[PDB]
Amino acid sequence: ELPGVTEEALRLKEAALEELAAQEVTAPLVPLAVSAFLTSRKKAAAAELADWMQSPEGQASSLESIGRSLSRRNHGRSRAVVLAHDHDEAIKGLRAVAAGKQAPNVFSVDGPVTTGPVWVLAGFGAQHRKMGKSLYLRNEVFAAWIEKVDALVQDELGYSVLELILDDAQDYGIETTQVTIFAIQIALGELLRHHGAKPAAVIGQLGEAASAYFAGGLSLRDATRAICSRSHLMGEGEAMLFGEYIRLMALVEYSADEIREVFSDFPDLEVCVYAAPTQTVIGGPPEQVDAILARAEAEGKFARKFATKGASHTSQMDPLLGELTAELQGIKPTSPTCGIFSTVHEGRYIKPGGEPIHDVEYWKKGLRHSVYFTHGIRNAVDSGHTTFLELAPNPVALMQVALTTADAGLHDAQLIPTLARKQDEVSSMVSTMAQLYVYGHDLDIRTLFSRASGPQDYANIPPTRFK
Template identity: 35%
Template sequence: GDRILAVVRGTASNQDGHTVNISTPSLSAQTAVYQSALATAGVDARSVGMVEAHGTGTSVGDPIEYTSLSRVYGVESPCALTSVKTNLGHAQSASGTLGLIKAVLALQHGVVPPNLHFTRLPDELADIDTKLFVPQAITEWPASGQQPRRAAVSSYGVSGTNAHAILEQAPATPTTFADHDGGAEPAAAASLLFPISSTSADELRRTAGRLADWVHAHDDVALPDLAYTLARRRAPRPVRTAVIASSQPELTAALREVAAGDSPYEAAVGRDDRGPVWVFSGQGSQWAAMGAQLLATEPVFAAMVAQIEPVIARECGFSVTDAMSSPQIVTGIDRVQPTLFTMQVALAATLKEYGVLPGAVIGHSLGEAAAAVVAGALSLEDGLRVICRRSRLMSRIAGAGAMASVELPAKQVLSELAVRSIKDVVVAVVASPQSTVIGGATETVRELVAAWEQRDVMAREIAVDVASHSPQVNPILDELTDALAELNPMTPDVPFYSATQFDPREQPVCDARYWVNNLRNMVR
């Protein structure tokens, strides 16, 4: 994750209001802004060990600021009082930012730097009863063990605006892969993606070569940290590619291959900022333990599955987490479809967490439910209603009909069905310009497959529970309409291309009628 330098516990700002003149600060307003920031932060002033003051060094402003600070900080315990203006002078509008940076560094290193050129307090301030002190040498700031180090930072505007922030030492960072004995990486980090980009193909090759040299020279490099930095901490340039590796030698070799290539993976080089099109698959794309590794290694993926788990348990009566983790492939249409939906939605959430956003989405058959959720056309709750109730009704007609794939254009298949006067089989899916899926009565489907095979046309029956997108699903369509009557369709956030409607460019309205058509109509 992000490297946290410090925690901003609370901030506050106010205005001096009416004063003697514009250059005279308000002691009461300054005191009030300190107390307001402390209240917002929820911390006691006694826990603040350093105050980075505005400290302009003026005979009017400094006594007022010192007096106001003494009323809040250093009342019972010592508190260092500093100002970065002794190092750099007044940076005008950037002075508050510099003070913040100085305070963060002090919190990080446990050291308060000295105030340059300070010798003693003016007589009118020396008599104030306070434990505030101005460090004249480097001062150690050890952690107490009971609470983190805390610092306060002030910045004032010439027109009377006062700002105050309470900072806290950053929390302890978790152990990284590189912290393991011998620098070895755990097995869970098997393969990682390393994206690289540049302004041209030639520059991309040079970038890959330089990175390969650097990786080769650093035996202790933590590959997960490098992959994270390349993916999240480098602005992508127009020409891009990526390599996959699980070890330092493998990464070095892959980068050198890019550097030496005549064309650096030209097919994988992106030149468009519109984002990738996400395609959501239909039934048959499941495999054993398909979510096990992601559940163990990707927190966002696991959190999304945990959010979905109780809904599927209530609607379908099984644990989708167990189904995705099981060494046995999930079976049964009422389990397969909700499991695939969960896998797709959780993968989408994970990709978004890594900064990968879709330029458009499209789904195949049941995949349209997950696509609709990711596009924003349906809420997650409504998407779950669609997939759970659809699959539950389909399980009641399991065994109805058959489906087969044939390497023929859809128009030719339709022509052959018409010539043979076949009414109980239809074109279910236009898979590609040269590939078609038919569905309908089992015996008729098998007769067609046999006839095509005799002509040396590639054809095979597909293992399915139900012949979707055919008349075999007609008995459950009215019930599906009723089950989805309460859906609340929304306008998609990204383009959602429909595989159900005749014109895929027409924006779908994902109501009950749409999902009935999604189950019954041809996928194209």
């Protein structure tokens, strides 16, 4: 039997709910969908809806009742969604749709995307103090999954991740960043699944643990053992590092090919992550890291050091591997239920129903060796994928994805973020789900609105005109 929500987490929740209740209520973001077989007809429906919402009767109906009525039409091949806070934004967005013009709150396509979405599970550098807290208090599905992971992590490591999420005075270190982002990744994807969505394939960059869960390669319990074992070993190892044993990590604007020649001058550098066509994260002794940084800056290339005294995906991980091996005994790798672009295995693809991959050796190899991220993405583009959806508290890896997709010739990919610092977390997920609908991916747009309890919940337009 699993541990429950701790007493301190309940105390922090009550206080956060009082802070929330005393705050300035903000208008929700509402998705208004129009569609038709022909784009020209879709454009006319948008202009007709805009005319009606400008009338006194349309002005008197809530955005939510308008969007609920729209959610019940036939959903045609040519689709658009206007995301709006008030009637003025809605009408303006609908004029854009009718005019075939672009606007920040408007998505409009002539037809569905041909291949299903790639879920991107990264996470490095995405953390911030209050990540996940707002959505936890305001979304019961997300909350339920956060609490489920909070219980497994309590059982594995002996502390509550929910306490960290709810206590604004606490911040994240190397260990707690990984397990908390994992919990947020699990809960974000299950929230999406609750509304009908699903990955055609996953790709990881920790995020590998959560990718294994959503690919059906491990149970939630064994994915949690994977992230817990790696996280606490890395945090405890990094904390004992001083002096000649410190190893830095840095981003440099070199491609894999340039790195090969550049490294001939720096015998102890290794590649941590091939992140984008000309962005590589390297690691090694501080004197050599500073020198490659100075070389890149002298060549007009950007370079940036990260905050860590240890370098994962380098030989410095060798002391941890034996203990990682011991802690992961008992996990049960299963056959994947969607595709996997494995950045541990050089970016290659594993098909749904393939042989399992997520055994103990996988997690050792992943922790010790380079992450072939840009290779996995390029493999996804080359096999027809155009929609990439990142589950994260901040869309860091989507910026890397955009660089690879453009470089592989795909200049209009669908790059869908989820949460973002200083963006309303509930509004962000409305947007994520509206985009999945517009491009034709699995999503039940009716579940974006509560069930109607009376006629005031509908608007006097098709298909719910009042008789």
